[PDB]
Amino acid sequence: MEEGMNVLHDFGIQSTHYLQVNYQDSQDWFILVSVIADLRNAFYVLFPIWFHLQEAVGIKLLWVAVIGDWLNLVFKWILFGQRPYWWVLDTDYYSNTSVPLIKQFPVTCETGPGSPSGHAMGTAGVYYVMVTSTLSIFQGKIKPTYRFRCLNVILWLGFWAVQLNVCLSRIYLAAHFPHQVVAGVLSGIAVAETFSHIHSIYNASLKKYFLITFFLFSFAIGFYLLLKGLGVDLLWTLEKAQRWCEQPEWVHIDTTPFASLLKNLGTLFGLGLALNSSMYRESCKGKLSKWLPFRLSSIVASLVLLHVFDSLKPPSQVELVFYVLSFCKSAVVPLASVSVIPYCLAQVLGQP
Structure with a gap:
């Protein structure tokens, strides 16, 4: 398994170096994309518009975002992810060759496991929900079905372009590996598809909401304490982040x-x-x-x-x-x- 992980990390580092060398004029664009891709937007600007245009779509969007972030947190605790910007200077893979040279930006030193991706998961889920909702709502065009096919093609092209830009943003910045964003996109799509067959959440009493919230809270805290008691390290990324960052001011504790x-x-x-x-x-x-x-x-x-x-x-x-x-x-x-x-x-x- 070690050989496969090393090869995957090497491919990620090579992709990061290629993107940074050949596209040095896209730094501001990639930083802006990484800033826009936050989930705070999905909770503050995306939710009100879709909720007031179609309530079911807004409720579905909020549920998908919340559940995706919860699963992201739990599997971030479990999976023991990795990041490129300390793996490049940490591993012994490049002992026999020349170490690749990569640049660090004020938004690349981060603390926490590197898998699964959060921005990719959130964007994938929310935008899949939006695209599917729009296509379902606009299935009544008075045209010989040519315009609807064109709309399908254009909307899917836009969704995939957004996904590609988000995926490349975290690779150029040297903050993720390609597999860590591919898996995040696939997981977001899977969650958004799963919440398409649950009709018990559009009209649910306050008791159900309270019980679901209590169950999620209790399971999260119980799993955290169980991991703590079982002799499992949960604070390991902080040391690497504070050791391998270029300057002792970008890291946020x-x-x-x-x-x-x-x-x-x-x-x-x-x-x-x-x-x-x-x-x-x-x-x-x-x-x-x-x-x-x-x-x-x-x-x-x-x-x-x-x-x-x-x-x-x-x-x-x-x-x-x-x-x-x-x-x-x-x-x-x-x-x-x-x-x-x-x-x-x-x-x-x-x-x-």
């Missing part, structure tokens, strides 16, 4: 390994509370639900206000307070977009 989990659970619980609240059942499901200007105004407000609100950062001096504040902060975005803004808009322009 967090010492809070329960941030993404709590943020995802908070978003899920906020959606659960919003869906069963009285504000949602009164405003978003009343008379002003089929009128396009109301939905457009809701989208615009839920974008601007959420982007302004995102500037608030919880303190990180106390771990428990940080966790509670992060949970409550992530639980507001769905609870805001679904419930509060539509209610305020309906009250403002519904009392003549």
